[PDB]
Each structure stands twice: as structure tokens, then as C-alpha cells.
Amino acid sequence: LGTENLYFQSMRTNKVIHVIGVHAEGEVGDVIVGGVSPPPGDTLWEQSRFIASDETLRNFVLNEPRGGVFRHVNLLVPPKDPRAQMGFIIMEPADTPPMSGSNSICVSTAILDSGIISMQEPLTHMVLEAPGGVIEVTAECANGKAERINVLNVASFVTRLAAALEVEGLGTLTVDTAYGGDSFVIVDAIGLGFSLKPDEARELAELGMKITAAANEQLGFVHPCNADWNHISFCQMTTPITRENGILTGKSAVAIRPGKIDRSPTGTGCSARLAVMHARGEIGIGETYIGRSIIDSEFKCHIDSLTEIGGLSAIRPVISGRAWITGVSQLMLDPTDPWPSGYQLSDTWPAI
Amino acid sequence: KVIHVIGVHAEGEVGDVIVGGVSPPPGDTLWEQSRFIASDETLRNFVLNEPRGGVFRHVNLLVPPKDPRAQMGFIIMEPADTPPMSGSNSICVSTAILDSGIISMQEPLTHMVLEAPGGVIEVTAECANGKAERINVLNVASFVTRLAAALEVEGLGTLTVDTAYGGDSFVIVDAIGLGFSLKPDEARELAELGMKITAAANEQLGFVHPCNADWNHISFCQMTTPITRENGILTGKSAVAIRPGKIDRSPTGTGCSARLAVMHARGEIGIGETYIGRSIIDSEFKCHIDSLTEIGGLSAIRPVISGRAWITGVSQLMLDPTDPWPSGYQLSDTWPAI
Ligand SMILES: O=C([O-])c1ccc[nH]1
Ligand SMILES: O=C([O-])c1ccc[nH]1
């Protein structure tokens, strides 16, 4: 990657994990490329359950002093599904989910830019496996770089349309719940008094935690084909969709536990929102939808095809965005460091 | 274009060290060079802001020293300031310098002289098996500027505080009866209370260093619990609030220096007597007063701060010219707003 192979003899006793730093439309998605053995498990899903329950890797790479609550880190593993060329496990600050759009884009970009999978130009096609299923990727490549990644995400669908939700201090809200590769409660920000400007980030994150907590209590979440994913991960706070020079476009702020707004438009969020829109006849197959984030970054999306999941109408959405490499690192653990799993403090890692 | 960084923390507090890829800033003193870093902001934003840094990082730039006494210089980049000195960061710098081979390592002890923007510090590193395991730093002259001054703080009435310099500037206040324990899960509350006290101290008391007019504000609020003795050794805990709202994970070497100046002014500790400073996560700096001196008309001390650092990784930071955020960004969810 235009990087030097650095070596320091005084560090020879440290365990070492090789990471490529990346963000997609502003949202960090670092990629572990070396130093970590595939977790135990016959399925990728099972491997991800190990990562979630064991916690050792998660804490090492996500906690200060090496990570920070703004990071996500993805572990590359061999594919289990014969269709796939590479598997990956997504580690978010407080969850290990079935999918993540921005992180899948980071993974695709790191894999191709570093030569882990060979690059064709102008297009590279590959199949990756996430814990929540196989995804098909088309990378637009030029000059040895993967410039834009198009991801055919897993089946997305509505679980509740216009449900009532009681939240302390806010009375009764009307919300949707849906799956886009991860689970969402979706609510209008305008009625909550927000326009989704960047200076609102902390207030939106805290408001989002509260709404997601209420939704998990009152509504829950069921994926008809995944009995293991039974909670709402995210609160997606939206402003209404408009048409700009012919193209449908909408903004949201997605609150990630324990309290951080996605800097990207949230690929799973756009997938979920597209599922609601299609259910209400607000968009059809093929039509472009531009999702925007709190910092005005963008994903270009469309519905690729329709399908069905445990008898629910579903969509296969495409999410497209760009990622950029921010660095390469070797993470080390000195056996005498008194914080081998890092630490968490409420000043920089939101409590609760 | 690639910046080479050794990641380090000293007693929990991050102090990454840039060891290659960045030319020294213009200036005829290290202070002038640090002023360029502070005003230009390009390097600071790139290494401290997300997506590469985070509000919990500090990053140090090695440069050739301007002071003839020194062998290596460094510029400390903290989240909202580029200050004269930082104890934890000087320990990370010393550790990285020796572990990387930038200055040769002798065992069992290496002696070196470094230059921070606030002046020259003398370092003795305890080295074994090719590693610098413990760093002993003779910090810059430290002194009290006000003992037991009144400070009005909204919601708290009137506090009695000290202001002092330990290589950076402090308002020092007793946490007992302020209603928080010095515990990791009170970190956010303490950081916010600290910002508020520092703001009040800057408005009502201010800070002047006799030797340099640019060191003209109070950087930190040091919230203490009373001195005790543990395992026979005088010891005290503090939580230091770093702008824009983070508690030092180390005991704060400049804060220990300032507290020692107060203690000495009050006859609570003599020259050579060990004092252990403790942090919110119970990490430790072993300190003592080495000697006495005078700064302008002020009585002052030369304190030694001792701590251990550990390498967290080695990194190469890069910037893609099409990246829309070449200076990163700051958002209030993870980077506390002013
Ligand atoms: O893009 C996404 O789906 C995502 C989830 C969390 C952060 N980004
Ligand atoms: O050890 C210190 O002096 C320090 C200042 C800021 C963080 N640590």
C-alpha cells in the first residue's frame, strides 16, 4: 500500500496484529489482515458469535489506548460459504452484527488495494461473506485503486410499520422497525425538534440511545431466518425525503451504541429505509436513492430486486460509496502492559 | 507523505511519537516551532482528529533541539493545546526514542537531555533487555502562583483553590465535598466540572509565567483527594481535566509537579522525599523534589516524575488526495464541544 515494512528489535516480545486503516464516507472501518486466527465455528455466524462472547479481540482493538469509540474493526477470515472468496466479522463498539454497509465497503477497498484479492479494471467483481450472509460486490477500479464499491446487501424488510412507541419525555412516537442487514427503529427527527446538523451529534446520539432502549422493550425485533438476532441495534432519525434534480434523496442520523452518530449515511440504514419506502409504494426497482449523513456524505442506492423472507416481502438493495485508506498499523501488546484489554471511561466512551 | 508513528502510553495516557515523515517546523526556538504547529494546525488536525486520532490521543513530534544543552527536541500536541510540557508525554517520547534507536541505549541506565517547548528536561531511563522500562524525568521549574485563592463557580458557591505551574498551568481544588469520587465511571462528570472550574479560574485568577508571556492561561483543573500514606509512602490521587473534557489516565506529571510545589510551600514534603501520584485508574508516578530554585520573584522547585510506558503499536499514517476530509473532522458525540 506504499507502506514500509518496519521492524524494531526492542518490540520483538509483543504479540502483533496487522491492520489497514480505512473509512467509508467518513465512517471508520479498519481491517485486520494478519495476526489473528479464524475463530472456532462451522459457520461464519458461529465464528462471529465467538468474537462477541469471547471479547478478547474486540476489547484489544476497540478500547483505548488503541481504538476509541469512533472505530469499527473488521476481521478477515476464510469464507465458509462456497460462493464467497473472503469472510469478514464486523466489530462495532457494543455489538457484533450480521452486516454493516460502510464496513463492507472498507473491507472491499482494503482487500483490493492491498492485493489480497486481485484487481481487475475498470471493474472487479467479488463475493464476500458477512455473518448475516453473502454479499456481491462490484468495485470500480482505476490506477490500481478501488475508487467506489457497489454492494448488493442481504435481504432487507419491514418488521413494523407505524408502530406506537412511548418514550420518557417525548410522549408517544410513531416509528417503523426494519432490517437492512442490521436492525432499526426509524423515526422522524423533525417532530423531535432536530434538523440533523453536525452540532446536534451528541444530543442525537443520546436521544437515539433512549429511543432504541424503548423500542427494544416495547417492540423487540424478529428476523424470520435468524433466531439469534433479537434486538434493535440502531435508532435512525430521519428528515423527509425530497427529489433533487430528479433524484430521490434523504438524510438520516443513525445512533450507534453506546452513543455515536454514524458519519456515513449508514448502508444498513438506507437498506432498511428503502424497505419501508418500497412497502409504501414510494420507490420501485432501479430508482436511485441518495442517502446522506449528518456530515453530508453520501451513498448512492437502489433496489436491485424483490424477494421474500419467512413470508415477509423483502428487497435486495444496492449500496454504493467510496472509502479511503488512512494508514497501516501493527498493533502490539507488551506482556507487561497492565491494560492488555484496554479500558473504558465515561468521558470518552459513553456510559450505560 | 507517510508519517511514521510509534504508539505509546505512559501509565495509561496515550503519547504517540512521530519518528519520521515530518520535517521540523520553522522557528529559531522550540517555542516558536510549537507556535507554528499551533497556528498552522495542519499536522495537529491530521494526527489528532478522527478518523486517525481521537480526543483521547496526544501526539508528539520529534525535532532537533534548539537549546545547546539538549540532544532531542519534541513538540506536544494535545487535543486543544500545544503546551510547554507534559509529563506522561515526555515519558512516552523518552521510551520511543530509546526503544527505536534514535538515541543509543545504555544499560542499566541511559542519561539524556531533551528539550520540550517549555524548556530542557533531564532524563534517566532504566533499561534492561533492550527496552526502556522506567523513565525518570527532571521536569522544568515548578512553582505556586496563588495559595488558597477564592474562586466563585456557578452551582458550587466559593471554592478555595491554588494556582500553580508544573510545566503546564493548573487550578487545583479539593474534590472532597464536591460530590464525586475520583473513579473511572465519574470521568465524564469530573471532566465537565473541571472545564467549568478552569473557565472560572481563567476569568477570575488568570495565570502568568514570569519567563514567557505566551504561557498566559490556566490549562487544567486538578481535582485532588487528600494526601495519605500507603505502604509507608506519601501518596495522593487526582483527576486532571484536559480540554475539551477528558480526564488524564496518568497521574499527570505536570500536575504532580504543581502539587509538589504547593506541598513544599506548606512544609508538607522535603527535598528527596518520595511522593506517589495516583490517577483515576490507579496508575502511578513516583515523584520527588530534587532541588529548589527561583523563577522571577517566585520560589520554585525542580521535581522528578517517574513512570513506565508501553508500546501499543507502530503505524504509518497516509492521506489519499481524494479523501474529502484531509484534516479529519470533530463532532460533539465523541469530541466534547466548547
Ligand atoms: O453502514 C452501515 O450499515 C453502518 C452500521 C454502523 C456503521 N455503519
Ligand atoms: O503528564 C502530564 O503532565 C499530562 C498533561 C496532559 C496529559 N498528561
Side-chain angles (χ1 to χ4, degrees), chain B residues 13 58 78 85-89 220 242 248 250 252-255 285:
Chain B
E13 187 75 346
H58 307 277
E78 309 192 9
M85 244 299 284
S86 169
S88 70
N89 280 289
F220 299 127
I242 298 162
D248 191 353
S250 82
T252 323
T254 57
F285 283 154

Side-chain angles (χ1 to χ4, degrees), chain A residues 24 27-28 72 90 92-93 97 99-105 153 180-182 184 234 254 256 260-271 299 319:
Chain A
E27 185 73 353
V28 173
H72 306 279
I90 309 143
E92 312 196 2
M99 243 297 284
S100 170
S102 67
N103 278 291
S104 74
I105 288 165
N153 198 9
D182 202 341
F184 290 85
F234 296 130
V254 165
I256 298 165
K260 173 223 177 184
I261 301 306
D262 185 355
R263 289 73 168 98
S264 84
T266 322
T268 58
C270 293
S271 294
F299 280 157
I319 308 307

Side-chain angles (χ1 to χ4, degrees), chain A residues 180-238:
Chain A
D182 202 341
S183 49
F184 290 85
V185 62
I186 310 178
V187 62
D188 166 54
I190 297 296
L192 293 166
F194 297 90
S195 60
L196 305 188
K197 50 184 187 302
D199 64 16
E200 302 172 345
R202 172 50 136 165
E203 295 168 86
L204 291 163
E206 292 176 354
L207 179 63
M209 296 302 97
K210 184 161 76 163
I211 295 180
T212 292
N216 272 310
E217 171 68 25
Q218 297 166 48
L219 310 171
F221 170 80
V222 173
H223 190 299
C225 306
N226 186 339
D228 273 17
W229 204 248
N230 319 110
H231 67 280
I232 302 288
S233 299
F234 296 130
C235 178
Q236 176 184 155
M237 289 157 286
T238 66

Side-chain angles (χ1 to χ4, degrees), chain B residues 139-315:
Chain B
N139 193 13
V140 299
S142 300
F143 50 90
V144 179
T145 46
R146 299 170 189 263
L147 269 188
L151 182 69
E152 293 167 0
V153 178
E154 178 191 65
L156 305 179
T158 303
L159 312 175
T160 300
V161 307
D162 309 314
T163 57
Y165 185 80
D168 203 340
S169 56
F170 291 85
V171 57
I172 305 179
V173 65
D174 180 17
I176 299 305
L178 280 184
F180 297 107
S181 310
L182 301 191
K183 301 175 179 167
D185 66 14
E186 295 194 329
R188 168 57 152 175
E189 300 94 315
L190 289 168
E192 291 174 355
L193 171 61
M195 297 296 97
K196 174 164 59 164
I197 292 173
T198 294
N202 276 309
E203 190 176 321
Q204 298 165 46
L205 304 177
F207 171 79
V208 176
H209 191 295
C211 309
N212 190 316
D214 287 351
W215 310 339
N216 59 12
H217 67 263
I218 293 173
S219 304
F220 299 127
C221 178
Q222 179 182 153
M223 291 157 283
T224 62
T225 53
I227 291 156
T228 59
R229 195 179 279 280
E230 311 290 340
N231 309 292
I233 311 303
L234 287 170
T235 178
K237 183 174 282 189
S238 74
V240 167
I242 298 162
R243 285 169 296 124
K246 174 216 172 181
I247 302 306
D248 191 353
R249 288 76 168 98
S250 82
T252 323
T254 57
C256 290
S257 292
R259 189 178 190 166
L260 282 170
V262 173
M263 291 162 63
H264 188 260
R266 286 184 162 148
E268 299 186 89
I269 199 163
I271 294 164
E273 182 169 12
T274 304
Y275 171 80
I276 292 180
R278 291 209 206 184
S279 78
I280 192 167
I281 59 167
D282 283 320
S283 62
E284 301 190 345
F285 283 154
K286 176 187 67 186
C287 310
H288 68 271
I289 298 171
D290 175 79
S291 71
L292 302 182
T293 190
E294 181 85 4
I295 293 291
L298 308 176
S299 301
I301 60 171
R302 294 300 306 278
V304 172
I305 307 307
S306 179
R308 300 187 290 162
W310 294 269
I311 304 297
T312 58
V314 169
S315 60

